[model samples]
Target: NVIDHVRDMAAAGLHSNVRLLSSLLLTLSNNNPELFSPPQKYQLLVYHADSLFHDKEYRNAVSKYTMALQQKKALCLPSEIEVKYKLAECYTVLKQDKDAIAILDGIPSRQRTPKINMLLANLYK
Candidate 1:
């Protein structure tokens, strides 16, 4: 598989690339359902997205979070809510208020706790 080739490249002392690693991991997870499983794959994406968010890489964080959302059916409700919430924050930091608001709106009202409401309220102001 391509993952094996990627591992070979790494073993051969090739330059490590962030994009390549990410692409490899995503492809591997997508192709090997038995190994990674949907929730595990989703968790990986969330962890990566969280790292990007904490690193102030808002654009990349948004992309990763969006990827995580694509696996929404595999995620728990709370996980979905948290990912969307963080994604909204990323958009907000990038000065994309409309996008942030749109994302927040997609979240169910029941899932929008006081903290999220405060964020939405601030976005409106």
Candidate 2:
């Protein structure tokens, strides 16, 4: 229910509510971290990073997204690329195109999507 609520609100452009919920989630984790599993932590960190990104806290989102993916095994293939894409996004926003360039380039050629390649071309151009 809460997850659906957040999704609904975000789609409706109520980002402040997402940030509000993110803070609650963070405090809950801070106070009762034992309740979180490795995968759950990964999800929460990613959610928090998304929230930060939506709220224009791009720098903090980079760190949280980095933290999420650093526990790399917690994420599977598709989501792993998605996280890297998001991290590259933050770097791009901060005008760190070299960092973004390095990220998509690091993805193995076989695993890469053409859209990612398109973005690389845009930056590399």
What tens digits encode model 1's per-residue C-alpha lDDT throughout 1-125? 53344445533645334335655677677687776756666766766566566567899989989978998665432268878889999999899999999999887898788878988999999
What are the RMSD figures for all models against the true structure?
7.3, 2.8
TM-score of 1: 0.71
lDDT of 2 by residue, 50-82 (tens): 889988999999998888888666442228888
Reference-based lDDT, each prediction: 0.73, 0.78
Q: Which 10-residue window of candidate 1 scores lowest in summed lDDT?
A: 10-19
Clashing pairs in 2: none
Each prediction's TM-score against the native?
0.71, 0.80
The candidate that wins on TM-score is 2
Model 2 alpha-carbon drift over 4 Å, by segment: 1-14, 74-78
